Amino acid sequence: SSGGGPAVVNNYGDIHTANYDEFYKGQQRREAQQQAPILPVR
Amino acid sequence: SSGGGPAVVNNYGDIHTANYDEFYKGQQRREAQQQAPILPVR
Amino acid sequence: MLSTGPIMETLTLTVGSAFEIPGWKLRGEYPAGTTSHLVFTDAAGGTLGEFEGTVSAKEIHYLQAPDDVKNIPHGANFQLFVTYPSMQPQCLYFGTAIRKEPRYPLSTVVSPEDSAVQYKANFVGQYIGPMWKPMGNGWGSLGIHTHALISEAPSMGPNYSLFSSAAARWLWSMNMDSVTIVVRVLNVGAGKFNVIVCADYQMQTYLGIQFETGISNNKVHVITGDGPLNWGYQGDAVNNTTANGDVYTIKYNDLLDTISCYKGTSLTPLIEASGLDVPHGEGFRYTGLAWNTALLSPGVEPTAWEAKDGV
Amino acid sequence: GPNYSLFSSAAARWLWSMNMDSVTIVVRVLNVGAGKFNVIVCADYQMQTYLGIQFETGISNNKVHVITGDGPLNWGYQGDAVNNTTANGDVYTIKYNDLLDTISCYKGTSLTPLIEASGLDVPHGEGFRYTGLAWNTALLSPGVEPTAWEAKDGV
Amino acid sequence: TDFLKIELIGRDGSHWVLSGPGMGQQGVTLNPNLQQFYDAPVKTLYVPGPFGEEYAGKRVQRREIVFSVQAYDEDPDTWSTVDSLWRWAWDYDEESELRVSTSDGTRFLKVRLMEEPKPYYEKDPHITADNPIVMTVTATFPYWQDEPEELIWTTLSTEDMTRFPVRNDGDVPVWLKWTLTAPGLWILPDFSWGNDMYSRGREDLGRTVAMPELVAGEHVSVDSDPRVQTLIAVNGMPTQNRWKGNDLLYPLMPGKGAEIPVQLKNAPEGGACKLTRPRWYSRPWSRPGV
Amino acid sequence: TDFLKIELIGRDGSHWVLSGPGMGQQGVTLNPNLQQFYDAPVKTLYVPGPFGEEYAGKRVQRREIVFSVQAYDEDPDTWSTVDSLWRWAWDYDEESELRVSTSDGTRFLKVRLMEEPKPYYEKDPHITADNPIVMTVTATFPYWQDEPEELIWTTLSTEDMTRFPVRNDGDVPVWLKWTLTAPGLWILPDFSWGNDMYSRGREDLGRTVAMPELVAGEHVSVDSDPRVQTLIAVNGMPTQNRWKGNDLLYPLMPGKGAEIPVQLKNAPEGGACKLTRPRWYSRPWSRPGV
């Protein structure tokens, strides 16, 4: 039952419902966390 | 047979299985290739 | 479909088999005097065959010897006409002849390895060209010298701005062990000019004829390869004074295992050597030239070079 | 050569055909007896009509002839016969030149024609570009036979 | 049927009749339901506009033909021979010919294996000796074509001119090929035929372009199709390097024809030219179009 | 059928006959509908072009064979023994042979477990003692193989030369392996066979590459296969550093062969050269082609 349907689509990963804008915003947030404290205040 | 199934899904392109992580990493790698040599050593 | 038309049909041919159309296939009613003929043409329309059928009261029979049809290729298009008495011919069938037989591709095709080659060079354009690969001294070791002072054509030699010796390997190889080289050469100074045959890829081992000229050293040697710039004298030298525009033919005969050099149009070898310990066969069919001079000026250099398979 | 266990005279044709009328045949031969060896040029697909150079080895017929073929195993002679002795490892070059309509045979390294003929009446062009060899011996032992054969199109 | 014949000439020169008169003589027949076989696949382009979308042009796509053949024989050993010969008749690197013959003539398509063939049934094929092979072949050049029409004009004069009758009776524009001898300066026609692709349809009605002056021995081939470089010399000389960016721009549009003029100047020997007009069609059979 | 026999040689040396004469003697038979078993999967590359897309080459893909077997026996205990033995015949790390014998000879494929087998029905297997196992095996090397041909040349001379007869009867190019003794300087053929993938198809017709001089004890394996390093010294010395950028570039193209020359020089105690020529095919059976 699970093997061969949505339960294996989940194993496939982001083939069905998965959004681009949220992923891009998350990557931007991670980069901002990485780089914000080292940017100058000027 | 081929026309109207997975063989035309391939023509559609990245509608089914395709992840965002390696695409973003590849874009970052291309930008790093473009910009790394011209970044100063300081 | 108001008008009568032919039927697209096919014919079968076999080598060594008699071409035959049975009468019961060409049935119908045929009065006396009716004649049937079958015409085979090619892609251009040229008739490559014509045969007459044996029309009977109710059947038409075709029967030809295999030699009559052996010249008809597969894909040749046929046309079968019936002609009632006092009437124009009426085409019954038309189509194509296929050959149902063992297929021999190797007979028809000729491989590039199974082809005699002929190469030529004249150096009249004042450029080396892409067909000569420098050897010994690396890239840019060759050059073209005009000899405009005398009424002579340009000749290939070493790049005397950098080197006094050089080699050149003709880019492609021969397809036979036996080979003929024809060189029209100029003697404008002292030096040694080698015509090299049966060479390997890097010209490490080869046979060759060396024309040496100098103040008192005008002779011809048979040399073996020790590298593109080194050689070993084989046998005794033969005195030979080279003049401008002299034509020499270097023929290596494989079955005789003999490399000989003829001067001009002489029917007797100017020099000759046999039984040299040099590898021959596939991988040992490259050819080339070499130059070596003490001074940085041209010595003996080829105005015209030509090569051909076989002797 | 012929398989002397059950044959005496035998002819062979090269499977392929030359692409041009002029041709060169370089043959290295052996003389292990008495007989006749024909190098066959400009033959048809059955070797019915052809030119040829025949090497005869014998007590009194150590000679070379120019031959015109009437069938693979039967032939006639044209012109005189040139004296020639053949040793083991002898190399002969039979050149047919179409421009001069000539057939010539050279021995060893010399470029002078050992034998020559011109104007012989044989068909040429397409369908007459087949080469071959022939052996004819009175005894059942090898005579003059080729150890090496090579053909080149054109002269 | 006798109205249609389909043959395959393999890359090895083998000849097969899949359908039509004499089909199956070599052991292989053609199963039904073959796709992308008749019309050349073309996709059209559209830009956004005030009334929806506006036409932007068309592009012809490569043919992706999928078809099944049936290899049969009475005994399994001969069936194996037939299957092996059929497999040998195909390749990936080089293309085999697929000819269609009707009352409109014979048109051929060059096809190669797009992927591995899918042979046989579920069980082993020696049980049946009658097995299907599904084949996915591809046509890089998607148009069906006939033998091109060739014309030759030779001259001995130093300066001369000639007229070549040309007419596209097919469905699609064709690109002309020229073979020009050397030495000599040629002027070749590049008529627009009313084609407005560069917005010069009637400005280039009588366009003629001069090739660079050919030196001795530099016979050239001037192929106007975009697949290949335009000017190529047979002696290897870089002819197009001397052409200042000039080119042939226009194909012979369908339904168009005229007496195109060829001019030769500065030819001391007097040269020759040959015009090749391809016969491309988008369909295996079609009535001629005026 | 007697025309086709399929066997498995397991990683533990077990011999199973799945199909053909003697099938099922070890308890395991082969079920129909086996995929990617006959033709080597090849993908073709296409790149945009003027008339759609243009052919850009081919890439062969690893084989993925999904096939079912049936393990059967009269009693559940001995059936369990048979099933355990069949499972023990396979592994993930090490490969086992799948051999197909027909009138064209015997050709094998090295296959390994791609994933875990899917055994039995939905109920208890001991109920029926006759159960199917679904196997998803993979072939990293996708070509069916025959036993490679080995040739030995031993010479006592300081300098010598030999002619190795070589011929590719398969439908795919093969890569030669050499085993050269030391000391001595070897010259090995790297003939292009007309292959033009380095733009030197005719320039390298008789190409020979000179290996670096070998000191005593430096026996070398010189494999042209891209999967392995070309020069491998048996004692671990870096011998590719003395090779100056030269390499063996060309495989043995299909339908090609000759007497390739191998030269040995400067050998104080003679030398031995072994030539291994693989025999690769893209099908379990096929008639010879030329």
Side-chain angles (χ1 to χ4, degrees), chain E residues 60 62 76-77 80-81 83-84 88 92-93 112-117 120 122 124 126-127 138 140 142 226-227, chain F residues 1 3-4 32-34 38-42 44 46 50-55 58 103 171 283 285-289:
Chain E
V60 61
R62 77 173 166 93
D77 275 315
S80 194
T81 313
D83 186 76
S84 304
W88 276 112
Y92 310 94
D93 283 310
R112 49 158 52 85
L113 283 180
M114 194 198 314
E115 64 187 5
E116 65 279 354
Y120 318 138
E122 58 179 5
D124 64 334
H126 291 97
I127 282 178
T138 186
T140 300
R227 291 210 298 290
Chain F
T1 62
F3 312 97
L4 163 60
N33 195 21
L34 74 172
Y38 307 100
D39 272 318
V42 170
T44 43
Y46 304 104
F51 297 98
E53 279 182 309
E54 309 282 303
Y55 181 69
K58 58 182 267 286
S103 64
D171 46 352
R283 267 175 159 217
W285 64 86
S286 75
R287 301 280 179 234

Side-chain angles (χ1 to χ4, degrees), chain C residues 23-89:
Chain C
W24 61 271
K25 295 191 157 179
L26 285 169
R27 266 189 326 260
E29 271 304 318
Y30 308 104
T34 306
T35 49
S36 175
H37 57 111
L38 183 45
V39 190
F40 291 83
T41 72
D42 52 5
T47 288
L48 59 86
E50 188 176 1
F51 314 109
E52 271 275 325
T54 313
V55 190
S56 84
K58 289 191 286 182
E59 309 195 314
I60 308 175
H61 179 72
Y62 281 83
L63 183 45
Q64 302 289 327
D67 304 331
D68 296 348
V69 292
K70 68 163 292 199
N71 47 353
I72 307 170
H74 68 279
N77 46 11
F78 76 95
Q79 217 164 356
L80 192 146
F81 296 89
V82 71
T83 312
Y84 297 96
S86 69
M87 264 179 250
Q88 299 293 273

Side-chain angles (χ1 to χ4, degrees), chain F:
Chain F
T1 62
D2 53 354
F3 312 97
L4 163 60
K5 182 177 189 107
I6 305 184
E7 310 105 353
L8 183 83
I9 315 296
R11 65 179 176 88
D12 52 345
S14 48
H15 199 133
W16 308 79
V17 178
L18 315 176
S19 164
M23 63 169 274
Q25 295 306 306
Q26 303 88 21
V28 177
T29 80
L30 180 66
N31 290 332
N33 195 21
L34 74 172
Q35 89 183 11
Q36 288 206 14
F37 186 81
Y38 307 100
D39 272 318
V42 170
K43 94 181 301 202
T44 43
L45 324 177
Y46 304 104
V47 73
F51 297 98
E53 279 182 309
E54 309 282 303
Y55 181 69
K58 58 182 267 286
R59 303 272 181 285
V60 71
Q61 315 282 109
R62 67 173 172 87
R63 274 181 199 253
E64 303 181 358
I65 318 167
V66 174
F67 69 101
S68 188
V69 291
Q70 193 93 14
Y72 158 81
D73 194 355
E74 286 87 4
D75 48 347
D77 290 308
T78 301
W79 163 86
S80 194
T81 309
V82 170
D83 173 53
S84 182
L85 290 186
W86 173 256
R87 181 56 191 82
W88 273 109
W90 292 95
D91 200 34
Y92 306 94
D93 278 316
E94 49 199 355
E95 280 165 328
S96 59
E97 278 192 357
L98 190 58
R99 317 185 72 192
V100 163
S101 182
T102 59
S103 64
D104 289 289
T106 311
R107 302 176 195 184
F108 62 88
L109 197 58
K110 303 306 293 287
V111 285
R112 59 158 52 85
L113 274 182
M114 201 200 311
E115 49 205 273
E116 70 283 347
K118 275 80 186 167
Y120 312 118
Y121 294 121
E122 70 269 10
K123 279 213 188 82
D124 183 31
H126 302 92
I127 290 164
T128 44
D130 184 9
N131 294 288
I133 304 167
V134 184
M135 313 284 296
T136 312
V137 307
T138 195
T140 292
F141 196 75
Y143 295 122
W144 290 80
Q145 293 180 355
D146 219 326
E147 289 278 332
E149 305 289 339
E150 306 175 357
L151 294 184
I152 306 292
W153 173 63
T154 314
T155 187
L156 277 296
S157 301
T158 299
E159 305 193 359
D160 213 346
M161 176 198 164
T162 198
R163 285 304 172 114
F164 276 107
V166 69
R167 173 76 64 187
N168 194 328
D169 68 313
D171 46 352
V172 289
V174 307
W175 299 91
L176 311 174
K177 192 186 172 66
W178 307 90
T179 303
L180 312 180
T181 55
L185 198 148
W186 296 88
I187 297 89
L188 293 178
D190 195 30
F191 292 179
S192 63
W193 310 105
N195 186 275
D196 207 359
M197 73 197 191
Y198 286 106
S199 72
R200 293 197 307 275
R202 200 172 172 189
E203 299 85 322
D204 293 358
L205 269 184
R207 171 182 209 246
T208 55
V209 65
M211 329 303 306
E213 174 77 32
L214 306 176
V215 302
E218 197 192 316
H219 313 85
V220 292
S221 73
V222 181
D223 197 345
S224 290
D225 216 1
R227 330 212 287 279
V228 298
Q229 174 179 359
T230 313
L231 280 172
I232 296 293
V234 75
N235 62 349
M237 270 195 286
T239 190
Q240 201 148 359
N241 299 348
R242 297 173 291 139
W243 204 21
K244 292 170 316 292
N246 214 355
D247 202 296
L248 286 160
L249 319 167
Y250 297 99
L252 186 68
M253 292 313 289
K256 301 292 188 72
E259 315 282 324
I260 50 182
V262 170
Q263 284 163 288
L264 168 67
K265 302 175 183 181
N266 295 320
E269 301 89 7
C273 170
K274 171 169 197 171
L275 158 73
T276 299
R277 164 179 81 77
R279 207 150 72 250
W280 297 343
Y281 308 94
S282 60
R283 267 175 159 217
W285 64 86
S286 75
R287 301 280 179 234
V290 76

